[PDB]
Amino acid sequence: LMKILTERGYSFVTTAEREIVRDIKEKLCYVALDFENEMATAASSSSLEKSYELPDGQVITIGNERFRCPETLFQPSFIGMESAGIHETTYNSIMKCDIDIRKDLYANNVMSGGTTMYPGIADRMQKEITALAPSTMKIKIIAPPERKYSVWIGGSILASLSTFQQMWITKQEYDEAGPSIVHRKCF
Amino acid sequence: MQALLGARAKESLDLRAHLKQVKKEDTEKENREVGDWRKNIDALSGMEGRKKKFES
Numbered sequence: 001l002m003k004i005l006t007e008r009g010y011s012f013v014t015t016a017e018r019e020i021v022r023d024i025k026e027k028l029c030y031v032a033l034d035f036e037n038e039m040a041t042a043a044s045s046s047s048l049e050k051s052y053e054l055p056d057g058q059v060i061t062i063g064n065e066r067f068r069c070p071e072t073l074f075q076p077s078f079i080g081m082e083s084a085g086i087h088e089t090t091y092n093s094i095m096k097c098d099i100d101i102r103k104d105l106y107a108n109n110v111m112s113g114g115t116t117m118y119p120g121i122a123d124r125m126q127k128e129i130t131a132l133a134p135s136t137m138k139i140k141i142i143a144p145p146e147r148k149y150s151v152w153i154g155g156s157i158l159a160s161l162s163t164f165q166q167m168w169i170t171k172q173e174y175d176e177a178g179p180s181i182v183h184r185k186c187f
Numbered sequence: 188m189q190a191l192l193g194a195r196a197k198e199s200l201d202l203r204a205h206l207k208q209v210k211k212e213d214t215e216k217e218n219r220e221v222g223d224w225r226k227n228i229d230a231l232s233g234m235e236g237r238k239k240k241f242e243s
């Protein structure tokens with residue numbers, strides 16, 4: 001996003017500028033369920049632009065840059081990565097599991113982490129897998145408001161489970177073994 | 188002259204009737220395992236909100 005905003009006349013190269021672009025992205029960007037058609041109009045008219053107030057009183061608007069940024073999730077080649085996107089990797093993780101597993105993973109595609117908060121991501125990912133998946137199978141995405149905070153929440157859940165109280169390394173075992181103990185006791 | 192054909196046709200029938208009667212008596216005496224069951228569902232129509240678990 002910083003490089004394409006530079007293309008539009010908004011060059012952000014220092015730390016304050018970088019932190020600001022991240023904030024702009026979080027509030028203005030979306031994935032688009034059809035990149036090329038969305039771009040055809042975003043690149044042609046101000047009607048698909050959204051404004052942002054910069055901290056110094058200046059303003060910026062974002063056009064196709066608004067969706068080209070998250071598009072890298074579907075097209076990693078945008079940043080120089082040799083990859084077909086997060087939906088191909090999701091597809092392969094389902095496909096590479098045993099044949100009696102595949103049906104359950106297709107129906108339980110879980111979005112987690114941040115960036116899951118770009119509008120349309122929960123739906124585009126179901127579309128992209130459905131397009132690769134066999135027919136008959138149900139493809140479904142799980143995308144709760146507990147998105148981006150799901151790892152922390154999982155930590156809270158796990159730390160407090162009765163089924164997890166035997167998984168903790170105590171500060172006894174730790175000193176006898178040293179920190180390498182984590183590879184035997186945790187994961 | 189026909190006494191033996193009568194007796195022989197009858198012996199065959201009595202044995203066949205015996206063998207069929209034995210499997211038929213069990214077929215008719217008990218018949219629950221040969222039937223079926225409701226196999227009902229959950230639905231969760233009373234699920235008006237989240238559960239007490241940290242996972243819900």
Ligand SMILES: Nc1ncnc2c1ncn2[C@@H]1O[C@H](COP(=O)(O)OP(=O)(O)O)[C@@H](O)[C@H]1O
Pocket residue numbers: 022025026027029112113114115116117118148149151152
């Ligand atoms: N509305 C949003 N639009 C685009 N990206 C987002 C949005 N919300 C969060 N993200 C991005 O997700 C990342 C946060 O990663 P995160 O999953 O929360 O790591 P952690 O689980 O350790 O907290 C940041 O790069 C942030 O900009």
